[PDB]
Design a protein around this nucleic acid. Structure first.
Ligand SMILES: Nc1ccn([C@H]2C[C@H](O)[C@@H](COP(=O)(O)OP(=O)(O)OP(=O)(O)O)O2)c(=O)n1
Ligand SMILES: [Mg+2]
Ligand SMILES: [Mg+2]
Ligand code: NA
Ligand code: NA
Length: 326
DNA sequence: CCGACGGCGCATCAGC
DNA sequence: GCTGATGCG
DNA sequence: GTCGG
């Protein structure tokens, strides 16, 4: 937490580029710098020291320099004052509303939570449930609640079929003391890269979790990616738990290790690892790792039987989930 | 300087 | 109905 | 915005 003020400034910068400028690479630049400073185990005394790290360049060096002197970034000071940017930023915190929708709403005078509620019928479905549970989705989930939710999902999943395996991934598998949401990877032996012997494999799971009133809302749903809302049961007289985001991702069982690498994350660790795969001459997605040769074309999937095997290929010594928290 | 910067599922829309 | 591009997580 | 070539 040594440079919590620095990395925050970079995060506020990155959200602005994504949400206002819609400059997704500047946003990825700032989020990379942010991450590589967050794990740097000294208290950064100057911009020049920060620039030594990969991902901090000159622009970010001047800004760290300004921030260390005054305790602020004048560029950020004005971005806070700007009415329209402040509004676009705010509406993006609603699930299902990205930078384009946040700008389109602001050009209609829709700038606040009241305006959203008042104009609910101008929201698609995901954005309706996003706004419904706006405050809840702002809360983090203590790991203790993540452990309760895990019991339910896994025990309902094996009521459906003892052959399902469900693995909780995301920050939970990385050992986080609290989680933004719950991320569940699902495998059944019928669904492989070879064949879909069984239909509606994900639907059966979603149905059961709805029947026991765990899943309460759906943001989106197809054959391999469910995205909705869930809520722990509360005791008699207890106040209710907040509603929680839940994502469920069904992966061909023979492709489990590429799946659990992807879903365990983080997004940035994934991005560094896949970038460095390209530099090694490979591509990794959630399903496969493959070579690219001569052309710009993926070859055939290399064999994988462990998460480490993926690290071996790109010549990275293996890293525990709790060390993949970039 | 300049191209690359990770990758893909689902919802929605435009254009047939 | 499609397919393809774009928004969003 | 930053990197590699
Ligand atoms: N742009 C992204 C977003 C997500 N993921 C990945 C890796 C993640 O770890 C996982 C789950 O996504 P989350 O949004 O749940 O991210 P985390 O679980 O890691 O963090 P949080 O605790 O906020 O949920 O999918 C990715 O690869 N690229
Ligand atoms: Mg999560
Ligand atoms: Mg998620
Ligand atoms: Na560097
Ligand atoms: Na949003």
């Amino acid at each position: 937490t040594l440079n919590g003020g620095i990395t925050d400034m970079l995060t506020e910068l990155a959200n602005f580029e994504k949400n206002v400028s819609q400059a997704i690479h500047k946003y990825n630049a700032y989020r990379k710098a942010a991450s590589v400073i967050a794990k740097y185990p000294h208290k950064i005394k100057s911009g020049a020291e920060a620039k030594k790290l990969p991902g901090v360049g000159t622009k970010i060096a001047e800004k760290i320099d300004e921030f260390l002197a005054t305790g602020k970034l004048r560029k950020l000071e004005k971005i806070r004052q700007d009415d329209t940017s402040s509004s676009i930023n705010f509406l993006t915190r609603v699930s299902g509303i990205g930078p384009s929708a946040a700008r389109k709403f602001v050009d209609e005078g829709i700038k606040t939570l009241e305006d959203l509620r008042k104009n609910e019928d101008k929201l698609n479905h995901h954005q309706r449930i996003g706004l419904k549970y706006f405050g809840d989705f702002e809360k983090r989930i203590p790991r203790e609640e993540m452990l309760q939710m895990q019991d339910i999902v896994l025990n309902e999943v094996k009521k459906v079929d003892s052959e399902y395996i469900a693995t909780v991934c995301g920050s939970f598998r990385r050992g986080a003391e609290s989680s933004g949401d719950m991320d569940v990877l699902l495998t059944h032996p019928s669904f492989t890269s070879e064949s879909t012997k069984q239909p509606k494999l994900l639907h059966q799971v979603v149905e059961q979790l709805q029947k026991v009133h765990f899943i309460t809302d759906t943001l989106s749903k197809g054959e391999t990616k469910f995205m909705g809302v869930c809520q722990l049961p509360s005791k008699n007289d207890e106040k209710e738990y907040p509603h929680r985001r839940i994502d469920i991702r069904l992966i061909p069982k023979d492709q489990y290790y590429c799946g659990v690498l992807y879903f365990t994350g983080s997004d940035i660790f994934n991005k560094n690892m896949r970038a460095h795969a390209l530099e090694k001459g490979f591509t990794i997605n959630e399903y496969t790792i493959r070579p690219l040769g001569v052309t710009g074309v993926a070859g055939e999937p290399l064999p994988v039987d462990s998460e480490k095997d993926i690290f071996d290929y790109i010549q990275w010594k293996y890293r525990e989930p709790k060390d993949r928290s970039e």
